[PDB]
Design an enzyme around this catalytic site. Structure first.
Site, short mmCIF file in Angstrom:
data_model
loop_
_atom_site.label_atom_id
_atom_site.label_comp_id
_atom_site.label_asym_id
_atom_site.label_seq_id
_atom_site.Cartn_x
_atom_site.Cartn_y
_atom_site.Cartn_z
N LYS A 4 0.80 -1.21 0.00
CA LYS A 4 0.00 0.00 0.00
C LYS A 4 0.84 1.27 0.00
O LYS A 4 0.34 2.34 -0.28
CB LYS A 4 -1.00 0.02 1.16
CG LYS A 4 -2.33 -0.59 0.76
CD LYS A 4 -3.37 -0.48 1.87
CE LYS A 4 -4.06 0.88 1.87
NZ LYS A 4 -4.85 1.06 3.12
N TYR A 11 2.39 4.40 6.96
CA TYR A 11 3.66 3.81 6.59
C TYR A 11 4.76 4.86 6.50
O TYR A 11 5.90 4.63 6.90
CB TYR A 11 3.55 3.14 5.22
CG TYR A 11 2.70 1.91 5.14
CD1 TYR A 11 2.15 1.30 6.30
CD2 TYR A 11 2.49 1.27 3.91
CE1 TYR A 11 1.46 0.10 6.20
CE2 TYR A 11 1.76 0.09 3.81
CZ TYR A 11 1.25 -0.50 4.95
OH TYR A 11 0.55 -1.70 4.82
N1 LIG Z 1 -2.19 -9.00 6.47
C1 LIG Z 1 -1.81 -8.76 5.23
O1 LIG Z 1 -2.31 -9.37 4.26
C2 LIG Z 1 -0.84 -7.65 4.98
C3 LIG Z 1 -0.35 -7.49 3.69
C4 LIG Z 1 0.59 -6.51 3.42
C5 LIG Z 1 1.00 -5.68 4.42
N2 LIG Z 1 0.50 -5.82 5.67
C6 LIG Z 1 0.91 -4.83 6.75
O2 LIG Z 1 1.62 -5.51 7.74
C7 LIG Z 1 1.63 -4.67 8.92
C8 LIG Z 1 1.34 -5.52 10.13
O3 LIG Z 1 -0.01 -6.03 9.98
P1 LIG Z 1 -0.43 -7.56 9.99
O4 LIG Z 1 -1.43 -7.77 8.92
O5 LIG Z 1 0.76 -8.43 10.04
O6 LIG Z 1 -1.17 -7.57 11.41
P2 LIG Z 1 -2.31 -8.48 12.00
O7 LIG Z 1 -2.21 -9.88 11.45
O8 LIG Z 1 -3.65 -7.84 11.98
O9 LIG Z 1 -1.81 -8.52 13.48
C9 LIG Z 1 -1.76 -7.29 14.22
C10 LIG Z 1 -0.95 -7.54 15.45
O10 LIG Z 1 -0.74 -6.29 16.14
C11 LIG Z 1 -1.08 -6.47 17.50
N3 LIG Z 1 -1.49 -5.20 18.08
C12 LIG Z 1 -2.42 -4.31 17.60
N4 LIG Z 1 -2.63 -3.28 18.38
C13 LIG Z 1 -1.78 -3.50 19.46
C14 LIG Z 1 -1.54 -2.80 20.65
N5 LIG Z 1 -2.15 -1.65 20.97
N6 LIG Z 1 -0.65 -3.32 21.53
C15 LIG Z 1 -0.05 -4.47 21.22
N7 LIG Z 1 -0.20 -5.23 20.14
C16 LIG Z 1 -1.08 -4.69 19.28
C17 LIG Z 1 -2.19 -7.50 17.47
O11 LIG Z 1 -2.41 -8.12 18.75
P3 LIG Z 1 -3.87 -8.02 19.44
O12 LIG Z 1 -4.89 -8.50 18.57
O13 LIG Z 1 -3.74 -8.53 20.86
O14 LIG Z 1 -4.05 -6.49 19.55
C18 LIG Z 1 -1.59 -8.49 16.48
O15 LIG Z 1 -0.59 -9.25 17.14
C19 LIG Z 1 0.59 -3.56 8.66
O16 LIG Z 1 1.22 -2.35 8.28
C20 LIG Z 1 -0.22 -4.12 7.48
O17 LIG Z 1 -0.85 -3.16 6.65
C21 LIG Z 1 -0.39 -6.79 5.97
#
Ligand SMILES: NC(=O)c1ccc[n+]([C@@H]2O[C@H](COP(=O)([O-])OP(=O)(O)OC[C@H]3O[C@@H](n4cnc5c(N)ncnc54)[C@H](OP(=O)(O)O)[C@@H]3O)[C@@H](O)[C@H]2O)c1
Ligand SMILES: NC(=O)c1ccc[n+]([C@@H]2O[C@H](COP(=O)([O-])OP(=O)(O)OC[C@H]3O[C@@H](n4cnc5c(N)ncnc54)[C@H](OP(=O)(O)O)[C@@H]3O)[C@@H](O)[C@H]2O)c1
Lengths: 366, 366
Positions: free
Chosen positions: A124, A156
């Site tokens: 993104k 980002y």
């Molecule tokens: N998923 C995809 O397909 C994808 C693709 C490309 C890029 N990305 C990017 O990758 C990055 C990381 O996202 P993701 O998709 O890997 O995440 P995700 O699978 O939704 O997991 C988010 C993580 O962050 C933790 N978290 C959120 N708020 C928190 C807080 N206040 N304190 C502590 N932990 C917290 C959550 O734990 P809890 O639930 O306990 O809060 C969980 O462990 C983002 O920038 C996203 O846009 C993701």
């Protein structure tokens, strides 16, 4: 007895997430670079049952709370590598930036052998979405890491700017990882496409309905790409350990392309149900709307199949499938990584099936 | 003195071709697998000036003539690997099959240490072209090596059938290589896109005209793929030497995708001339027709720039650019090769420029 020795000590911020949960596995493999690894895993929720049997030191912490983060992370003097694989679950630039600043401010002054910070963002970076998620409007794919920032708000950008400032001041190396759409297994992610589509297929099967493709014509037929969560973990570990990769922005995808029409056929086969593919002339419909009243159905499916207890809104992100299914022209390049010597890849069709298999193995899905 | 010793002895059938000419270079590198290599290079024309300074034993032979092929190739008792990288220049199934049968019938009985036969075909295995080259109509991309033959005439089928029959009878290993569109440097190829587009750019520059894109809208904007000739050589050598790769049908592409709109911009930059890209609403025009009266212009360009003497119809294949520029949905997969351990790749944008640079270096193009 004596304290265990480790070569490297990871702080995985977002250990319950789609990439964090894979890092929790990959970091503990005997041949993983930089090993043996000690793993601290941070997330806000109490440790779920599906992570309590892993050799990860779980730290429950709301990383948006500065005093709490200081209290919980400042004692961890042995951290050598940070893997920031979290976001707050909104696009708010300030609140996402707070989370990451709090991690750095709590660890940098206390972890004297800290070496490297890995920041996970995404593709993104390269494009914008307008009109309530409905107008995905990319330019210049295949996306390469020399493309300039778009002149729009994007958290980002804020995360990168913090990364550069804090690592530069403190003589730390950095990497920015920009994964494609992730194929993974976590039932606690805010954006897990495989789980989302497995939940939909499961609900269809339970209701004796076909697996009806709800998406656009363009997304059915176009070339798309993705990245296995385990490959993102491998890529992040590579950049964390290999000097050749230091201080680089790096895309991360499986190395190939696929089409959703082919994935759809495999998904139906995997769930033993009829497929209804794209129908010429039909407009996309909202999967979020199709699923809006299904929370209680999902509860009953969980009970009937003795699954790990999950809430529908947590295991699935139907809104995210709706965006995927009106997206095209989002292919990213892996040339930079390959030219730096990272030759990790996955067969994306096999990766999609591996994720289904894993979620079934772990009893997240029937 | 004494006869030189070699580890392996190649017969490159089509040494003046787009892949053969690259094999003539790659096989002689000190770290090439299976080396040191002796190289016999076969083609029908007398050895061109641009191949006479390479350490290849050139054999002028019309391989469509059985008695001639026996006479010229039966004495070569030391051949260990055959690389069949030729075709007759038409789609005739019988005449192409004759060429390949003649090579096998002349070498198999005489080369007692023969190990392997490499057959180069192509991605046209996966799709058909109808209506005078104007209707390219593929199904099921990304193309994989498990796809069944189409129920149409295709000389690739005849070549494969000969390969399987002759290698099976004689306890030889085989490989079928299916390259994507090739990026290479030979000025004697019947299908060299880079040379074709460099010739067009050169003629435009000579005439003080812009580099006007003549192709379709779809081909300007779609994802496309290609393969550097040097990578095809590496892939063929891998299958010739590595036991893991034996007796396999294998696609060969650079590992990435590109768009012609981006290539076009680079081509104009490379020739220091204005670009006119695709214009909304314009139908494709024939580059063959634009160039039909340019033989004498090309002769004058050769003289003025002191180039290697080439005839326009031999250095360029405008008809082939016209097919490329109405093609879409032809992406092929490299997963099978990667999963077998071949991790060779090229950055396709860099590969396109490398080929321009090489053709200039060798004085084929100004
Ligand atoms: N998923 C995809 O397909 C994808 C693709 C490309 C890029 N990305 C990017 O990758 C990055 C990381 O996202 P993701 O998709 O890997 O995440 P995700 O699978 O939704 O997991 C988010 C993580 O962050 C933790 N978290 C959120 N708020 C928190 C807080 N206040 N304190 C502590 N932990 C917290 C959550 O734990 P809890 O639930 O306990 O809060 C969980 O462990 C983002 O920038 C996203 O846009 C993701
Ligand atoms: N070029 C591409 O972009 C491309 C892409 C994918 C697949 N392929 C496939 O690759 C295969 C090989 O073609 P290519 O493109 O590599 O060939 P090419 O560059 O046109 O070269 C053809 C070679 O065959 C030789 N040859 C032709 N007739 C001969 C004869 N009677 N006796 C001896 N030598 C003869 C030519 O030598 P002379 O000129 O002396 O006859 C030349 O060395 C074909 O099946 C083709 O479809 C090509």
């Amino acid at each position: 007895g004596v304290c265990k020795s480790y070569k490297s000590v990871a702080l995985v911020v977002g250990v319950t997430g789609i990439v964090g949960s894979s890092l929790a596995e990959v970091l503990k493999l005997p041949d993983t670079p930089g090993g043996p690894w000690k793993v601290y895993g941070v997330a806000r929720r109490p440790c779920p049952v599906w992570l309590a049997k892993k050799p990860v030191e779980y730290i429950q912490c709301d990383v948006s709370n500065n005093q709490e983060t200081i209290s919980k992370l400042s004692p961890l003097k042995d951290i050598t590598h940070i893997f920031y694989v979290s976001w707050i679950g909104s696009e708010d630039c300030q609140t996402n930036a707070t989370m990451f600043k709090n991690i750095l401010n709590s660890v940098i002054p206390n972890a004297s052998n800290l070496q490297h910070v890995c920041l996970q963002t995404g593709i993104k970076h390269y494009f914008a979405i307008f009109e309530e998620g409905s107008k995905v409007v990319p330019h210049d794919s295949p996306f390469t890491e020399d493309l300039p920032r778009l002149n729009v708000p994007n958290f980002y950008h804020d995360l990168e700017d913090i990364l550069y400032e804090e690592t530069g001041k403190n003589n730390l190396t950095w990497s920015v990882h920009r994964p494609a759409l992730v194929f993974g297994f976590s039932p606690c992610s805010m954006m897990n496409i495989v789980s989302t589509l497995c939940v939909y297929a499961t609900i269809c099967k339970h209701e004796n309905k076909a697996l009806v493709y709800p998406g656009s014509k363009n997304s059915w037929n176009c070339y798309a790409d993705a990245v296995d969560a385990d490959l993102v973990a491998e890529h992040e570990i590579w950049a964390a350990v290999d000097p050749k990769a230091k201080n680089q922005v790096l895309n991360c995808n499986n190395g190939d392309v696929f089409k959703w029409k082919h994935i759809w056929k495999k998904l139906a086969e995997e769930f033993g149900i009829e497929m209804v593919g794209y129908v010429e002339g039909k407009e996309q419909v909202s999967l979020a709307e199709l699923m809006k009243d299904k929370d209680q159905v999902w509860d009953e499916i969980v009970k009937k199949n003795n699954l790990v207890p999950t809430k529908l809104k947590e295991i699935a992100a139907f809104w995210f499938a709706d965006i995927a299914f009106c997206s095209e022209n989002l292919i990213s390049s892996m040339n930079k990584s390959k030219e730096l010597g990272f030759l990790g890849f996955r067969n994306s069709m096999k990766s999609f099936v591996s994720c289904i298999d894993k979620m079934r193995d772990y009893r997240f899905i029937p």
